[PDB]
Design an enzyme around this catalytic site. Structure first.
Site, PDB file in Angstrom:
ATOM      1  CG  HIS A 297      -1.891  -1.050   1.003  1.00 20.60           C
ATOM      2  ND1 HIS A 297      -3.587  -0.606   1.204  1.00 20.60           N
ATOM      3  CD2 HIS A 297      -2.277  -2.127   0.499  1.00 20.60           C
ATOM      4  CE1 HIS A 297      -4.323  -1.672   0.976  1.00 20.60           C
ATOM      5  NE2 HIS A 297      -3.464  -2.682   0.445  1.00 20.60           N
TER       6      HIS A 297
ATOM      7  CB  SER B 143      -1.340  -2.023  -7.905  1.00 21.38           C
ATOM      8  OG  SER B 143      -1.723  -3.038  -7.221  1.00 21.38           O
TER       9      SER B 143
ATOM     10  CE  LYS C  75      -9.753  -7.478 -13.320  1.00 21.42           C
ATOM     11  NZ  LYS C  75      -8.437  -6.678 -13.182  1.00 21.42           N
ATOM     12  CG  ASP C  76     -10.660  -8.917  -6.163  1.00 21.75           C
ATOM     13  OD1 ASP C  76      -9.760  -8.793  -7.408  1.00 21.75           O
ATOM     14  OD2 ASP C  76     -10.032  -8.426  -5.335  1.00 21.75           O
TER      15      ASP C  76
ATOM     16  CD  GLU D 229       0.079 -33.836  -4.395  1.00 21.60           C
ATOM     17  OE1 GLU D 229      -0.547 -35.141  -4.109  1.00 21.60           O
ATOM     18  OE2 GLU D 229      -0.289 -33.066  -5.257  1.00 21.60           O
TER      19      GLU D 229
HETATM   20  C1  HEM Z   1       0.527 -15.871   0.848  1.00 20.16           C
HETATM   21  C2  HEM Z   1       0.616 -15.926  -0.694  1.00 20.16           C
HETATM   22  C3  HEM Z   1       0.431 -14.730  -1.223  1.00 20.16           C
HETATM   23  C4  HEM Z   1      -0.629 -13.758  -0.802  1.00 20.16           C
HETATM   24  C5  HEM Z   1      -1.787 -14.024  -0.023  1.00 20.16           C
HETATM   25  C6  HEM Z   1      -0.235 -12.515  -1.619  1.00 20.16           C
HETATM   26  C7  HEM Z   1      -1.583 -11.361  -1.694  1.00 20.16           C
HETATM   27  C8  HEM Z   1      -1.235 -10.209  -2.571  1.00 20.16           C
HETATM   28  C9  HEM Z   1      -2.136  -9.482  -2.814  1.00 20.16           C
HETATM   29  C10 HEM Z   1      -3.563  -9.138  -2.532  1.00 20.16           C
HETATM   30  C11 HEM Z   1      -1.572  -8.630  -4.158  1.00 20.16           C
HETATM   31  C12 HEM Z   1      -2.198  -7.369  -4.848  1.00 20.16           C
HETATM   32  C13 HEM Z   1      -3.120  -7.795  -5.685  1.00 20.16           C
HETATM   33  C14 HEM Z   1      -2.377  -8.504  -6.979  1.00 20.16           C
HETATM   34  O1  HEM Z   1      -1.431  -7.885  -7.203  1.00 20.16           O
HETATM   35  O2  HEM Z   1      -2.413  -9.587  -7.441  1.00 20.16           O
HETATM   36  C15 HEM Z   1      -0.060  -8.929  -4.274  1.00 20.16           C
HETATM   37  C16 HEM Z   1       0.702  -8.255  -5.178  1.00 20.16           C
HETATM   38  C17 HEM Z   1       1.990  -8.853  -4.897  1.00 20.16           C
HETATM   39  N1  HEM Z   1       2.729  -9.739  -4.388  1.00 20.16           N
HETATM   40 FE1  HEM Z   1       1.747 -11.101  -3.203  1.00 20.16          FE
HETATM   41  N2  HEM Z   1       0.740 -12.750  -2.363  1.00 20.16           N
HETATM   42  C18 HEM Z   1       1.405 -14.005  -1.973  1.00 20.16           C
HETATM   43  C19 HEM Z   1       2.634 -14.624  -2.463  1.00 20.16           C
HETATM   44  C20 HEM Z   1       3.692 -13.538  -3.064  1.00 20.16           C
HETATM   45  C21 HEM Z   1       4.626 -14.094  -3.922  1.00 20.16           C
HETATM   46  C22 HEM Z   1       4.798 -15.537  -4.074  1.00 20.16           C
HETATM   47  C23 HEM Z   1       5.291 -13.071  -4.266  1.00 20.16           C
HETATM   48  C24 HEM Z   1       6.399 -13.032  -5.267  1.00 20.16           C
HETATM   49  C25 HEM Z   1       7.495 -13.853  -4.523  1.00 20.16           C
HETATM   50  C26 HEM Z   1       4.607 -11.773  -3.902  1.00 20.16           C
HETATM   51  C27 HEM Z   1       5.216 -10.569  -4.287  1.00 20.16           C
HETATM   52  C28 HEM Z   1       4.024  -9.676  -4.735  1.00 20.16           C
HETATM   53  C29 HEM Z   1       4.225  -8.361  -5.460  1.00 20.16           C
HETATM   54  C30 HEM Z   1       5.681  -7.999  -5.628  1.00 20.16           C
HETATM   55  C31 HEM Z   1       3.125  -7.944  -5.678  1.00 20.16           C
HETATM   56  C32 HEM Z   1       2.904  -6.663  -6.481  1.00 20.16           C
HETATM   57  C33 HEM Z   1       2.242  -6.994  -7.683  1.00 20.16           C
HETATM   58  C34 HEM Z   1       1.873  -5.693  -8.481  1.00 20.16           C
HETATM   59  O3  HEM Z   1       2.080  -4.553  -8.181  1.00 20.16           O
HETATM   60  O4  HEM Z   1       1.559  -6.061  -9.726  1.00 20.16           O
HETATM   61  N3  HEM Z   1       3.445 -12.282  -3.097  1.00 20.16           N
HETATM   62  N4  HEM Z   1      -0.041 -10.048  -3.546  1.00 20.16           N
HETATM   63  C1  AY1 Z   2     -11.292 -11.516   5.286  1.00 23.44           C
HETATM   64  C2  AY1 Z   2     -11.790 -10.842   4.040  1.00 23.44           C
HETATM   65  C3  AY1 Z   2     -11.367  -9.181   3.778  1.00 23.44           C
HETATM   66  C4  AY1 Z   2     -10.458  -8.907   3.172  1.00 23.44           C
HETATM   67  C5  AY1 Z   2      -9.106  -8.222   3.989  1.00 23.44           C
HETATM   68  C6  AY1 Z   2      -7.791  -8.982   3.531  1.00 23.44           C
HETATM   69  C7  AY1 Z   2      -7.469  -9.051   2.098  1.00 23.44           C
HETATM   70  C8  AY1 Z   2      -7.398  -7.671   1.600  1.00 23.44           C
HETATM   71  O1  AY1 Z   2      -6.522  -7.011   2.066  1.00 23.44           O
HETATM   72  O2  AY1 Z   2      -8.374  -7.451   0.751  1.00 23.44           O
HETATM   73  C9  AY1 Z   2      -7.992  -6.791  -0.548  1.00 23.44           C
HETATM   74  C10 AY1 Z   2      -9.035  -6.979  -1.525  1.00 23.44           C
HETATM   75  C11 AY1 Z   2      -6.443  -7.109  -0.871  1.00 23.44           C
HETATM   76  N1  AY1 Z   2      -6.042  -6.789  -2.213  1.00 23.44           N
HETATM   77  C12 AY1 Z   2      -6.620  -7.115  -3.598  1.00 23.44           C
HETATM   78  O3  AY1 Z   2      -7.430  -7.926  -3.573  1.00 23.44           O
HETATM   79  C13 AY1 Z   2      -6.415  -6.445  -4.613  1.00 23.44           C
HETATM   80  C14 AY1 Z   2      -5.493  -5.298  -5.024  1.00 23.44           C
HETATM   81  C15 AY1 Z   2      -5.445  -5.029  -6.170  1.00 23.44           C
HETATM   82  C16 AY1 Z   2      -6.056  -5.510  -7.229  1.00 23.44           C
HETATM   83  C17 AY1 Z   2      -7.077  -6.499  -7.128  1.00 23.44           C
HETATM   84  N2  AY1 Z   2      -7.784  -7.050  -8.100  1.00 23.44           N
HETATM   85  C18 AY1 Z   2      -7.652  -6.942  -9.436  1.00 23.44           C
HETATM   86  O4  AY1 Z   2      -7.106  -6.021  -9.812  1.00 23.44           O
HETATM   87  C19 AY1 Z   2      -7.025  -6.961  -5.818  1.00 23.44           C
HETATM   88  O5  AY1 Z   2      -7.812  -7.951  -5.737  1.00 23.44           O
HETATM   89  C20 AY1 Z   2      -6.353  -8.561  -0.830  1.00 23.44           C
HETATM   90  O6  AY1 Z   2      -7.059  -9.322  -1.480  1.00 23.44           O
HETATM   91  O7  AY1 Z   2      -5.447  -9.199  -0.243  1.00 23.44           O
HETATM   92  C21 AY1 Z   2      -6.107 -10.441   0.345  1.00 23.44           C
HETATM   93  C22 AY1 Z   2      -4.891 -11.459   0.530  1.00 23.44           C
HETATM   94  C23 AY1 Z   2      -6.124  -9.912   2.044  1.00 23.44           C
HETATM   95  O8  AY1 Z   2      -6.541 -11.137   2.826  1.00 23.44           O
HETATM   96  C24 AY1 Z   2      -5.682 -11.263   3.776  1.00 23.44           C
HETATM   97  O9  AY1 Z   2      -4.946 -10.356   4.004  1.00 23.44           O
HETATM   98  C25 AY1 Z   2      -5.634 -12.383   4.711  1.00 23.44           C
HETATM   99  C26 AY1 Z   2      -4.662 -12.567   5.717  1.00 23.44           C
HETATM  100  C27 AY1 Z   2      -7.192 -12.373   5.506  1.00 23.44           C
END
Ligand code: HEM
Ligand code: AY1
Ligand code: HEM
Ligand code: HEM
Ligand code: HEM
Ligand code: HEM
Ligand code: AY1
Lengths: 60, 79, 241, 49, 378, 49, 378, 79, 96
Positions: G200, G204, G226-227, G270
């Site tokens: 944040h 993004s 869209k989510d 796996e």
């Molecule tokens: C516990 C597994 C993970 C969760 C729950 C998680 C959750 C998220 C979420 C909600 C976003 C913003 C939405 C999106 O861009 O899709 C994000 C973006 C990102 N995550 Fe993760 N992610 C996880 C694993 C990773 C991994 C494997 C990496 C890379 C090693 C990573 C590095 C990033 C980066 C760099 C972004 C920025 C994406 C962008 O700005 O385009 N995170 N993640």
């Molecule tokens: C309990 C549900 C309330 C939501 C609060 C927690 C969840 C939360 O923080 O919500 C927002 C939705 C967070 N970001 C996005 O989704 C998101 C961000 C940029 C773009 C897109 N999509 C398409 O462009 C996205 O979808 C996201 O999706 O992160 C999850 C991993 C997180 O979830 C977590 O933390 C877990 C540790 C709970």
């Protein structure tokens, strides 16, 4: 004579009250009718059930 | 959250203080210590102590009567 | 021995996507289990009650349960007698100790049958083929004692006697107990002994497809609505002069 | 068994006293102990259930 | 520029215990917040090491614990620290809530309320905790209690059997409780942070209830070290139990496995539920007893609606100060009665203590408050 | 769909199709002399004769 | 005044998915962040319901799972959703990291790095996950792997037996893994929030790598719906497996209990570890094999130090775009080889694929970048 | 965190937009849809497809030689 | 468990060998008997719990590992219960 969708909006969709009331009232009847038609479709394409097998064992 | 500098308004007060490496950590520990805890104890006995002795009295009498209710029970059964 | 062959695609009555098992065929199969396999093959997980909704009925299940005698709980003297048959307990049968399976069938473990269809690659077909497969050893070859021949088998040297064609019966109403008819039925039952949920699973699966079939388009038309403001937005750049 | 003011039963958890009929007489218990479905097949045997 | 202030992570840590302004004024009654924290982690920490050896399954339940105590290298200290830390977690929880009423802290609605949620959850947790070893107390403790939901009109039965997994306590019930006893402390830990979040919104109350904005000190030195010393004291106590008196607060009969046939005329929940226990059975009613048991704790959430005084702390309020101690002693009474059999003296006195409790919090303290106002001319 | 998945999850704690055993027990009356309460196990619960 | 903005709690929620400004620009490759979130909770959620029925103890381990599948009302869907959700959690994790490299997202150091920490942890978790049912794959899977630490000079032996609780895999090892498989997803869940916290700070990245500040849209409508759609798609897939092809991605032989005597010539971790598996054994070395296995994943944390291009996304970079796909296909290669026996073709080709992998990420992509600079006159 | 109003500086751009209840959610879904995905596919085949057929060729040849290595093995052993 | 406490290495072995426990099954699914290891515990008197009742008239002599922590008073209650044994005064009864 307006439209179905129009008349529908006025009487039920406008207020979030009736709007929500409509969907809880509409979900009850949907769960029932969708489960009927569905299972029926599931049986019609089958028939090696335990349904048609019973006729044979009303006794013991 | 609230940080120093945005807390509140203060007018005309001076505050002198001293380095810890320049003073004692236990000024007059016993000399001034004991008298004070006596003073704080005194200041509060009357509001803290009473309910506890009340419980205390009810606790000893309560168990007493519990034994003397059964054990003491016989007692007399004479015929 | 190093080379191998894999099974064909027998068109089971439950191979298709939304296809239920043949309950009439699951029945005959249990029969094949009880008379034949049950004296060598443990089936620790299935029980007489499990059969209740599936093939048999209430009273019928009781009766089949009563045709054996299991060691019930100890009594006052620390007994452990025997009793008719409930519905409750399973099919723990052939041998106590595992090595006692080895002492009978020469050094070979006839593994649990609850397993089977999901523990061997190919599933039903491998068991179907392994049973109705049974062929004769060509040249080269050997064998120890009666380490029978089977192509659909790792190494081709099994220790299992081919208890297929010994035509046993009780196919109520009338069913020819031929080798192949007997093999389809065991398998069909063995499928159900591994994945009982099988039919419900696919019943729900139908609803899952049918539900998503209304939802996917809808929850998609919803997102369009909201993004349409952005999608048809018009830009103009109007700098000074 | 055989504890309480009524020569029947005593439940120690919150002090329920029952009689030899299994009826509640003192304590918080709202109803009498349940009498299960039963019959006598003879002078020596009783089958419950 | 000082990275300790602009880094997204440190900020939080700077705000938690470094730069946060606190009253130059708080005293020992404010330590139990760290102690509860410490308790929570240490509990989570020994609790976990027991889970690498514990089981579930009614057959092995008891056996595994003994396995740990006898066979597992050092399993005994771990096991006993866990069980004793559990009691300490109540002593502090108790003291914390105490500090709270006396000093008027409850005026921070959200914070107080999160704290009530924190109370019920650690209670709900510790309850499931003792069912685990599968001892006598564990079985009927797990029975006498749970049942209570069977007093709920129309659906009581359904729920109690749903929470049971059968028609009584067995198979389905031990695994269930273990899993819940595992996931709860994590959830609690979250709630704690929200508790703490809302607390930072106002900063801390103090012994005078006045307002210390005029004299705040940095958490840096001051309350970090006064938290360390404090925690050392909590260690002394926890270790005194574990290392000198392991079963002093533990019912000796949770030893000897379960037995749905028995029930040993005595049986009481762990000490920390005694006051509550006393209340419930001090009422000749299934519905009333449990209804009263609930109110016994859910009344904390009522306290703020009966603040009547024009001053915040009781520091300058003799009248209320007296009713406060009468409350404590009276709770010490309920605890004592709860610990006794439902017989002669014990019944009527525990019945009086109950009424007192509710009459004191609901009528006496609120009136003491108004009279003090009137005395001061407020 | 929310109904269903939630229901299914609710029902997985309800009572495992296996934990439903226990029906009829037969007790010899001549073994229980006058004045004694004899307890047996029935349907996973204590039964007093 | 709008309470949705000033309330300590909502703030967070407003900042998370209501008022947070996002690129009007992101596409489907950005959904896997919600999907991973969803995955994480659904995993935590079914996982928990299995724990109310599962056991541990080597004797009952396998038995309990079957108990669930056959006896526990609906235990089957729960069990299979858990096992299939686990695979989906990898498909997304994989896709997420993919999206990341292509688009240059890794330039957010802290965020990327937390994500690597998020990768290793869910890997470490899912590993322990499959040991639980105590099947054949579970036993030697739990053996072939863990051992690797025995390649560590001087102390390898000590550690592998310390993680074991014995001299082999048994008693001490199943309970251990269950407990760890229980506490990890909570810890992950925390780390995720910190991941998201650091995210944040910059907002993004987007398909162009340019900078969308000039055109941000509110998360409100837009990315919430869209989510939702997106999550529905994830449900379709997860349900397709569970309800039509439950064991399609599952090794059929984790059925049939353990047996320290056997070992069924085949055995592979796996699917989601196949590429890694291939790497390790494509090296005739105990130390080198495991060393190479580590680098295989820990290299992600190296990527940012080899960004060489003057543009951020690969959207306008044909040369690198080609090497990206060559990487994917090559990973699909490693996955395939990993799935095969260590014999004739399979050896040398999986040996080439390994070298390719490291040479591509370490030399090829960084050079493709510089040439593109030079081509553009940058 | 960053909020609208503090993002960045924008000079002279007009943006016309329309209410969702006033337009179609699927303007020319197929009419304009298909042509475009053809266009995007075309625009990218050459960078995505090649590595995959390469894997594809190596996969079929790889298994081939794996069977023909053993099964085909005998072959000849004549004496 | 006795090894570090009271006895010594060889001594423990010897005392373990003075009984005969039912060891693991063998090839034919046997379950013979064997001298005594060190490994196993003291599982002794009766198999089924009710077999304790069949011997001592309807009474369960409970596990001894328990004892000192399962009964109020601990050692002293067991010490007193053993060296206590006295004779029934008036009123009284007894069954057998
Ligand atoms: C516990 C597994 C993970 C969760 C729950 C998680 C959750 C998220 C979420 C909600 C976003 C913003 C939405 C999106 O861009 O899709 C994000 C973006 C990102 N995550 Fe993760 N992610 C996880 C694993 C990773 C991994 C494997 C990496 C890379 C090693 C990573 C590095 C990033 C980066 C760099 C972004 C920025 C994406 C962008 O700005 O385009 N995170 N993640
Ligand atoms: C309990 C549900 C309330 C939501 C609060 C927690 C969840 C939360 O923080 O919500 C927002 C939705 C967070 N970001 C996005 O989704 C998101 C961000 C940029 C773009 C897109 N999509 C398409 O462009 C996205 O979808 C996201 O999706 O992160 C999850 C991993 C997180 O979830 C977590 O933390 C877990 C540790 C709970
Ligand atoms: C229709 C009833 C039977 C069926 C369906 C059945 C099926 C099977 C199957 C599928 C296997 C394992 C195959 C594999 O490893 O891939 C097996 C192993 C075996 N069963 Fe049977 N069998 C049946 C009756 C018998 C009988 C009657 C005997 C007694 C001769 C028997 C003794 C064995 C033995 C010895 C093995 C070991 C084979 C080996 O692993 O070497 N089974 N059986
Ligand atoms: C999970 C158990 C709890 C933890 C970990 C916890 C943690 C804390 C901490 C660290 C503080 C600040 C330090 C202090 O004042 O001592 C605090 C203060 C407070 N807590 Fe809790 N507490 C818990 C249970 C409670 C309970 C039971 C209540 C009351 C129901 C409560 C309501 C309060 C209130 C009102 C304050 C403010 C105290 C003041 O300002 O003087 N919390 N807590
Ligand atoms: C999530 C971290 C925790 C884990 C992994 C955990 C796990 C366990 C396990 C496996 C047992 C049985 C072994 C034994 O009885 O010694 C147990 C007992 C118990 N733990 Fe926890 N628990 C945890 C947090 C807590 C919390 C928050 C409390 C509440 C203070 C708590 C209080 C208890 C109690 C009361 C018992 C049973 C009492 C006794 O040992 O006699 N534990 N725990
Ligand atoms: C803390 C929530 C979780 C709990 C309570 C939990 C508990 C369990 C339990 C008791 C089992 C054995 C039952 C079974 O195999 O079906 C299991 C299996 C497994 N779960 Fe979890 N787990 C949780 C989170 C996860 C996570 C985060 C993952 C990683 C996606 C995961 C992936 C697995 C895997 C791979 C298995 C074994 C695979 C299989 O079922 O065949 N679970 N889990
Ligand atoms: C991991 C350790 C780092 C600390 C961060 C977490 C811990 C945390 O936030 O630290 C500060 C220290 C927090 N407040 C105080 O201690 C505190 C506040 C006013 C006065 C005193 N003392 C004496 O006047 C205090 O001691 C406090 O003590 O809350 C704990 C419950 C919390 O602990 C928790 O959240 C748990 C959920 C982890």
């Amino acid at each position: 004579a307006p439209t179905l969708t129009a008349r529908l909006y006025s009487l039920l969709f406008r207020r979030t009250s009736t709007f929500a009331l409509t969907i809880v009232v509409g979900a009850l009847f949907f769960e029932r009718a969708f489960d009927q038609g569905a299972d029926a479709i599931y049986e019609h394409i089958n028939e090696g059930k335990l349904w048609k097998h019973i006729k044979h064992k009303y006794e013991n | 959250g609230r940080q120093f500098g945005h807390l509140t308004r203060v007018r005309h007060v001076i505050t002198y203080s001293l380095s810890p490496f320049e003073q004692r950590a236990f000024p007059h520990y016993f000399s001034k210590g004991i008298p004070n805890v006596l003073r704080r104890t005194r200041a509060c006995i009357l509001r803290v102590a009473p309910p506890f002795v009340a419980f205390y009295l009810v606790y000893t009498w309560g168990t007493q009567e519990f034994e003397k209710s059964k054990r003491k029970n016989p007692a007399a059964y004479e015929n | 021995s190093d080379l191998e062959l894999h099974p064909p695609s027998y068109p089971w009555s439950h191979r298709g996507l939304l296809s239920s098992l043949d309950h009439t065929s699951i029945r005959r199969g249990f029969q094949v289990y009880k008379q034949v396999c049950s004296s060598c093959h443990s089936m620790d997980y299935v029980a007489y009650r499990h059969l209740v909704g599936v093939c048999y009925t209430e009273d019928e299940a009781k009766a089949l349960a009563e045709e054996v005698e299991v060691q019930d709980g100890p009594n006052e003297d620390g007994e452990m007698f025997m009793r008719p048959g409930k519905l409750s307990d399973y099919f723990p049968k052939p041998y106590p100790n595992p090595e006692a399976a080895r002492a009978a069938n020469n050094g070979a473990l006839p593994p649990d049958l609850s397993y089977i269809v999901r523990a061997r690659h190919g599933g039903e077909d491998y068991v179907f083929s392994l049973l109705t497969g049974y062929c004769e050893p060509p040249t080269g070859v050997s064998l120890r004692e009666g380490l029978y021949f089977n192509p659909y088998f790792p190494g081709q040297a099994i220790g299992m006697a081919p208890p297929i064609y010994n035509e046993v019966l009780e196919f109520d109403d009338g069913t020819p107990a031929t080798m192949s008819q007997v093999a389809k039925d065991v398998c069909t039952f063995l499928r159900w002994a591994a994945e009982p949920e099988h039919d419900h699973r696919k019943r729900m699966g139908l609803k899952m497809l049918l539900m998503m079939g209304l939802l996917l388009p809808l929850v998609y038309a919803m997102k369009r609505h909201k993004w349409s403001v952005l999608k048809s937005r018009k830009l103009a750049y109007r700098p000074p002069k | 068994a055989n504890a309480g003011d009524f020569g029947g039963y005593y439940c120690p958890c919150h002090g329920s006293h029952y009689d030899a009929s299994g009826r509640i007489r003192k304590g918080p218990a709202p109803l009498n102990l349940e009498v299960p479905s039963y019959e006598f097949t003879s002078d020596d045997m009783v089958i419950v259930g | 520029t000082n990275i300790r202030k602009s880094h997204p992570l440190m900020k939080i840590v700077n705000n938690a215990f470094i730069d946060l302004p606190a009253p130059s004024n708080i005293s020992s009654w404010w330590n139990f917040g760290s102690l509860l924290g410490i308790c929570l982690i240490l509990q989570i920490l020994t609790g976990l090491f027991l889970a690498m050896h514990y089981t579930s399954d009614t057959t092995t339940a008891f056996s595994s614990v003994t396995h740990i105590c006898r066979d597992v290298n050092y399993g005994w200290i771990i096991r006993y620290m866990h069980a004793n830390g559990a009691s300490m977690f109540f002593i502090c929880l108790y003291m914390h809530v105490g500090r709270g009423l006396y000093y008027g802290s409850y005026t921070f609605l959200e914070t107080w309320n999160i704290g009530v949620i924190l109370l019920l959850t650690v209670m709900a947790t510790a309850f499931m905790g003792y069912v685990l070893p599968w001892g006598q107390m564990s079985f009927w403790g797990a029975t006498v209690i749970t049942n209570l939901l069977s007093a709920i009109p129309y659906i009581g039965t359904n729920l109690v059997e749903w929470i049971w997994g059968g028609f009584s306590v067995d198979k389905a019930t031990l695994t269930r409780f273990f899993a819940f006893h595992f996931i709860l402390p994590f959830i609690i830990m979250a709630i704690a942070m929200v508790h703490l979040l809302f607390l930072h919104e106002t900063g801390s109350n103090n012994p005078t209830g006045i307002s210390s904005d005029v004299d705040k000190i940095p958490f840096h030195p001051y309350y970090t070290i006064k938290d360390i010393l404090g925690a050392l004291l909590l260690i002394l106590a926890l270790m005194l139990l574990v290392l000198f008196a392991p079963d002093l607060l533990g019912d000796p009969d949770n030893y000897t496995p379960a037995n749905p046939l028995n029930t040993p005329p005595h049986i009481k929940p762990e000490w920390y539920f005694l006051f509550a226990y006393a209340i419930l059975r001090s009422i000749p009613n299934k519905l009333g007893g449990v209804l009263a048991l609930a109110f016994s704790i859910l009344i904390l959430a009522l306290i703020p609606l009966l603040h009547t005084s024009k001053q915040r702390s009781m520091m300058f309020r003799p009248l209320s100060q007296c009713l406060f101690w009468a409350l404590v002693a009276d709770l010490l009474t309920l605890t004592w009665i709860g610990g006794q059999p439902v017989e002669h003296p014990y019944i009527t006195i525990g019945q009086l203590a109950s009424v007192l409790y509710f009459l004191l919090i609901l009528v006496l303290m609120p009136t003491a408050g108004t009279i003090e106002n009137k005395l001061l001319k407020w | 769909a929310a109904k269903n998945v939630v229901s299914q999850f609710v029902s997985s704690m309800s009572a495992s199709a296996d934990v439903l055993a226990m029906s009829k027990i037969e007790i010899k009356l001549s073994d229980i002399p006058e004045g004694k309460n004899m307890a047996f196990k029935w349907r996973g619960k204590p039964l007093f004769v």
